[PDB]
Amino acid sequence: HMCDAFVGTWKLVSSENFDDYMKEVGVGFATRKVAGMAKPNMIISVNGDVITIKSESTFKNTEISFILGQEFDEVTADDRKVKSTITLDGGVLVHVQKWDGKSTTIKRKREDDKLVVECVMKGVTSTRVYERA
Ligand SMILES: O=C(O)c1cc(-c2ccc(Cl)cc2)c(OCC(F)(F)F)nc1C(F)(F)F
């Protein structure tokens, strides 16, 4: 029952400062433009200790499966090869990605009937709001 309120199929409904976030991450122009249009469906499921987060969109389809606190390899939508660790902290999923001596943190929170994603890279934050599909 660890992630019960996160489980389901979610659709992206709003985004703020995502281009800048991507610039800070180091995403290039063409990828930024095309990824920025995307309205992904995020599908979160749990089976025993393994959480799966799928992202389905027009640009790229991504999928990660993981155990909380256990590092894994991830290829991101912008094609970074990163080392990822996802933990639960006070009911918030906290995802850190490490690559090329860089780091970014993505937090996912249930807020009212929405799932809010806040991505941070040094100073720059983006907020992505999903609603149930
Ligand atoms: O949750 C998110 O909505 C999300 C979605 C994407 C994303 C997903 C699908 C497409 Cl087609 C394009 C971009 C993403 O791409 C990594 C980047 F931002 F570095 F490009 N990062 C996040 C993040 F940072 F917040 F986890």
Verify whether ligand 1 is closer than 6 Å to residue 82 (CB atom): no
Residue 6 gets which letter from DSSP? T
d(CA 3, CA 68): 11
Closest CA to 69 of 46, 91, 48, 95: 95
d(CA 92, CA 94): 6
Q: Whose CA is nearest to atom 20 of ligand 1?
A: 78
**Would residue 76 count as lying in a domain?**
yes
Verify whether ligand 1 is closer than 6 Å to residue 77 (CB atom): yes
How many angstroms from the chain centroid is the CA of residue 86?
A: 11
Domain of 39, in residue numbers: 4-128
**Would residue 133 count as lying in a domain?**
no
Residue 129 annotated as binding site:
yes
Backbone Cα Rg of the chain: 14
**Would residue 79 count as lying in a domain?**
yes
Question: What CATH number is given to the structural domain containing 12?
Answer: 2.40.128.20
* Six-digit token string for 63: 């999928």
